[model samples]
Target chain A: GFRKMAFPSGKVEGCMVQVTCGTTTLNGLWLDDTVYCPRHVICTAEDMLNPNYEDLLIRKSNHSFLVQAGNVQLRVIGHSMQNCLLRLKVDTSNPKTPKYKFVRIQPGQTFSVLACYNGSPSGVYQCAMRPNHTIKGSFLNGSCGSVGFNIDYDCVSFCYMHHMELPTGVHAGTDLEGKFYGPFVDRQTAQAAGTDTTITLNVLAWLYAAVINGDRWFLNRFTTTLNDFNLVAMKYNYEPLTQDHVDILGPLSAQTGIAVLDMCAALKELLQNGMNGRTILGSTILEDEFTPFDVVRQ
Target chain B: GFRKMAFPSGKVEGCMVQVTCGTTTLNGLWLDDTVYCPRHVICTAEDMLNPNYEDLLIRKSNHSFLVQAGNVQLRVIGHSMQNCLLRLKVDTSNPKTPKYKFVRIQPGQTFSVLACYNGSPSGVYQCAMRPNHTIKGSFLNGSCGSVGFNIDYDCVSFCYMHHMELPTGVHAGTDLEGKFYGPFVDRQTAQAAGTDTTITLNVLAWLYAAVINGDRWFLNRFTTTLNDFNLVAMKYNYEPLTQDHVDILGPLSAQTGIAVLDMCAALKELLQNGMRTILGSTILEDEFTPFDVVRQ
Candidate 1:
């Protein structure tokens, strides 16, 4: 005798099922690889014990990428933490080649790089480093040498959002011995220059003006998007700190870094303690200082 | 419904009315300025102070502007909502009077003023407030006393809808003292008080750039040229509480002084809020925080 049956979509990790229609039977399996956290440690690749993604730093997940060209390979490792030291290897010794030399890959500080190359990448791979095992040094100063590769924190928010719904890409200028160059790899020697393009007065003028004047104009940006949550009248609660407690993703993409002493003349007018200022539950927070409020290490 | 013959006008305090005509001649009334208010108040001047505001300011509805010469000008003192009990004084060199007197100006807190002048402001006044109305004993504090000049809330939303529009011509700033000041004053004194003339340059800068930045050919800057009205919107409601439920004749000009942390930066957003960053009712009114609910 023969019977028929039905089935649904994936519900759990590593689950499989089968169904039959008359005398025909079909089998299937499903899994969820969707990364679930805003931040996490991901496995870009592993020691042959997992999925086969071999030879060359390939796009691992939403956070990082890999590159392989002729014997010199580089994994531009990444992590969601503002500061995550990643581990890369030169798996050339049959299993272990040119090993770990210390280096700091702080998001705001620096990112991964490759210094020497052969016609084709010899060994290529990636891994994560617990914050404790991380150390700092330049990849060029050691066996990594200075003849071949590199990668860096590629911050693209600004040029990408670039206003007017049009995005333009800008790679931070890279350098080599005071004679820096890059986002590209081949070009050097005291005799010749690198490939390049110049910025026009029109573009520079537009960038600065858009940001500064936008302090007022764009503030209204959220206006059209406001909903019931958009309360012009509600008193909101305030806390005693700047950002919530945790490391930050870092300064916005376009800080020219003119950190003002923050004489905080303005902060005072807004941040005062105890049921002051119109905010709801505003009392819990305190404006109690002139700057960093003597109360804040104030 | 016939008001036949010519009607006579009201005298002293009552008003006038003519329901019809044809010889039936109908009428009877008095009260020159009573704007049948569901709000505001009609005022008359006198020299005594125990709160005979008893009928009018005792229920002071917020808002003002005014003037007169021998200088009895009405300088809308302001809307001191809530913690009021503000200061007031009267100075006359008239041998029949005391040099100056002190008084209370409640608002839920009082919102009224009246101006008049014959000779000069014989003596003068001043203060410090916010409940515990911490008033300094005295500082002749400031200003030269004129013979008998004076102006007040003239809460004329009462008297002007009270006066003749045949309710036209009021214009609030003219005197230095009873002449009326803000919306920008001081800008007129002597060879031009360097410290004076406005709030003009300052106020001038403020107007064109902020509120009128959208573009206005004429600001009529100062000189109380204030349009007879400026509204947050048309369907404004008034309250038994003040301006939220009561049937109101509606809007008045300028406001008193409660300018707190206007951190323009804060005004920055909500102002720009959903209205696409335009100025509207939300900006003109204070952000009223509400009570709680048991959502937990």
Candidate 2:
């Protein structure tokens, strides 16, 4: 006989579940706490669970635990699970620990949870819901997961990519009205006077010089985190490192080199008492040389 | 009988008569010439010996004799008739002496004399015909005769009289522009403003005072010769004396008085040799006078 079930009608709830070694089971209800499956099942819950619950379980981890909980029907379709890590925390007071289910979501579907608990927590609970080919990490820790989780679970959502190119130093968009502050050209004036390659070059040169001189520490930090492939590519494509580029680079590089050398010399002088001759020689000649040289190389 | 004396038409020879006076009478065809008359009648040869010659006299003289000659008449317009004292000389060699009769001319009517003589010793002859009241007298030696003649005449004509008065002083009717040269009015602005009377008066007074003071001699001389009535009237009328008048008058009376007083005071000091006497007298007089009398 088919037991009649009702959809749960309350807030969605879930937990960060860490999927460890072997077969970890999952059981929960759909929306309105309708029983998805009464108990844990092996291999598949096709006969016991609703077809909706079977559909949410698009894929399963073979060596990892399937952390599952309520309202498994809400997972977005076509989005496959990646880096199945179940994040959890033990609640000592509550005897029943919450479970998280994994689901491969398509582009247009919704993933939600319906569970019976005291009250919802303040912050968001994110899951590694999808794979990211652009980054080397578990799918839960990937950019897409973070972005999606932030979009869905958290109050604010922002994306940060490794070695992503961003305007550093004091950045402003091209359409910014700079008349009230520093000088910038709008679309109208720039178009009327013909294309301004020089202004573009000036902006580029300032950014490059700021990056090279370490005048922009923020951009330096960003560049250090950036992958060498992106950095080299960006540098190669950015042209017209002509007289203006040489003029900017020559003085700026010299000043930055002088500053870095002065700092190293100061550090060396300070550590002269503490450092042994070999240690000091190795740190100065071998290790620190690469750091300064990397910036000026090509 | 009416003598019808006839002569041949050509070259008829006849006796001619001449007259002389005072001496040498009747030589050949001459007659007595000494009888002085105011006029002498000349008779024709027919009337020369006529008993009524006196009646038919063509010339007459009052209170004197007449002389006859051929077609000649003489008159002397003088009172003297004896001894040819008053002479009618016909351009004579000596006009001072008598050679013919004298006649007297009377007043009221005009008279004339006619004479003819050969131009030999005399180049011109003069005669006088006189009427009674017109005769004048003079004396040559003991004789009295007329030296001048008189005439009585009257004429009728018309005349007109105009009574006009002219303003006096150096600047008369002709000199309407005042002597003091002027910008005349305040030319820089308009002239609803009153006359520049003060400046005009000051200039005029200074000029007047300067003329009176500097040219004293002129003013003195001028005042002396000036017509007193006109001067007095001009003074009353307040006319300014001219430069010409001032040049004559020596000095104006007022200036002269002041000059005299000043000069006298200086002379008195010089004579006294100092101001001490004058000051002493002044002090004494002031001491003697009562206060009210002093005021007086």
Candidate 3:
């Protein structure tokens, strides 16, 4: 066999074999043959000293399990009153011969054992758990195991996902109404509908008043212009005079008043002179002859 | 012949000539040609338009008339009341005619103008009254005339010195007696002795009291010390402490009390605790003690 069989060069192509051992993949081939022939494994052990190989032996003998374990122990711990279900599978090249297993542990109890069987040396193992479908929690692997065994023996772990509800007295809502009656509403409707409706009503009332009073004049103008062109005409009639009007009238009034006063005083003086009759030839003459004048005392 | 004659080459010396003119020096040089012909001449003119020569001539012509003038005429508005004496002089190399004249301006009512003439230009000139030996107030060379001039000038001024007497209503003897009766024994006695004696007695009483009761402790201590000396002992003992004694004792007691208190409290405490204890311990334990305590 020394005939040069070029060491399989470059990136080897293969499907990503997902052998989850409770939220972890155990995908890799073992060269040693003295251990169980490896395909995919879900291992359970009573303790490191002695493993519970009953389920593994049964699955192997029946030729259903495609996973194997060397000398590793698997353990699972359940949380609160909820029981946890452990699931195992090998998602790899042999789709027809998929491996799976399920085990349940009572709340506050431990199922410190795992079962797996061997087939071929190339099989990889994967694991997962449904802590409770109704409670919305899951555990992939190693959740029930210790760190030393999980790390050294290539075990993976995950905890059941949990979202705790607020206690009876706690106010989970942000606004005043919600702060007072939030727990009651959450129990009754289970939808946070009270908080959402209260916020929407407050916003809607503010917006309604704002529109009716025209408090935000520029915003009203923009909205009105966008909605109807007639709003522009209404605005023009109601709004106060702008700077352009003042600019047009201010100087014109001042000039007009001054001119009128000057003309009236000149006319009064001419009339007084006529009444006094102190007339001399060439003493006065009108500069603008186009306008006619009558004597006041004639 | 316009010829140069060479004399023997000899040593020539130079000196500063500081001329301080007096009334006599100015007059002598002005009036006598003989005084001017042989000497170094120096003069000053304040205003060339109105030289002081006329005033000087008038002053010399008749010593009874005073000259006056202003320092300046602003816009022809004359301020002719400021007057000063014109000092002038000539010095002769020869000592034969050592003549000097002391001229003075007689006080008068007319206004006079100011001008300059001089020897030393360093002195002020103002019209100062001379009352001691003269019947007229006159222009003098300084701001404050001497007592002689004051007495002389005041004699001719509005309050003529010689003509001034206590008014008729004043009762010279009675008024002065009233002022000095207490120290002079009685009003009648003060009057009989004349006001001068009354005033003298008053002053004497004040001075005597000031020397005695004004500073009693010092006077008492001095008396005690003086009496202790053998030569003056009997005389001092025989002398009585009088009204003056009471006067001096009052103030002396006050001052001496303060001095005694200071010495007893301050110096005593400082010498005892501050110096003795500190210095004793320090000197005995030199290596561990401070220098201030050690020295003390």
Native contacts recovered, in order, as a fraction for each?
Answer: 0.00, 0.00, 0.00
Error of 2 at B67 (Å): 99
Locate the minimum summed-lDDT window of 10 residues in model 3 chain B: B7-16
| Native-referenced TM-scores of chain A, all candidate models | 0.16, 0.19, 0.15
TM-score per candidate: 0.14, 0.13, 0.11
**Tens digit of lDDT per residue, candidate 3, span A75-175?**
21210111111232222222221122222221111111111112111111111111111111111222111100011111221111111123221112111
lDDT of 1 at A45: 22
Cα lDDT tens digits, model 2, B1-296, are 00001111000001112334333222111112222221112233344343243343324343243233334544333222211122232211221221222223211111111111220010001111111111111111111111111111211010100011111100000000111112111011221211211111111222233333242211221112224323432433322234443333234224445332232223223223422222112111111111111111
lDDT (tens digit, per residue) of candidate 1 on B1-296: 00001000001011222111122211211122211110111233231222233344455432321211232322233322111111111121112121221233211111111111111111111111111111111111111111111112211111111110001111221121122222312122222111111111111222223332242222222221112111211112211122231111111111211121121222222223422222211122111111000000
Q: Name the lDDT value of residue B216 in candidate 3.
A: 25
Q: Model 1, range A1-298, lDDT digits (tens) per residue?
A: 0000000000111111121112222211111211111011122223123422222224444224232322343333331221111122222212211211222221112122111121111111111111221212212111121111112111111000000000121122112121112222211111222222211111122222223323211112121111222131123322212121111211211341211111111122232232232321111222111111100110
Better of 1 and 2 by DockQ: 1
Higher-TM-score candidate of 1 and 3: 1
TM-score of chain B of 1: 0.18
List candidate 3 segments past 4 Å from native.
Answer: A1-298, B1-60, B63-65, B69-144, B147-214, B221-296
- Model 1 stretches with alpha carbons more than 4 Å out: A1-298, B1-101, B108-296
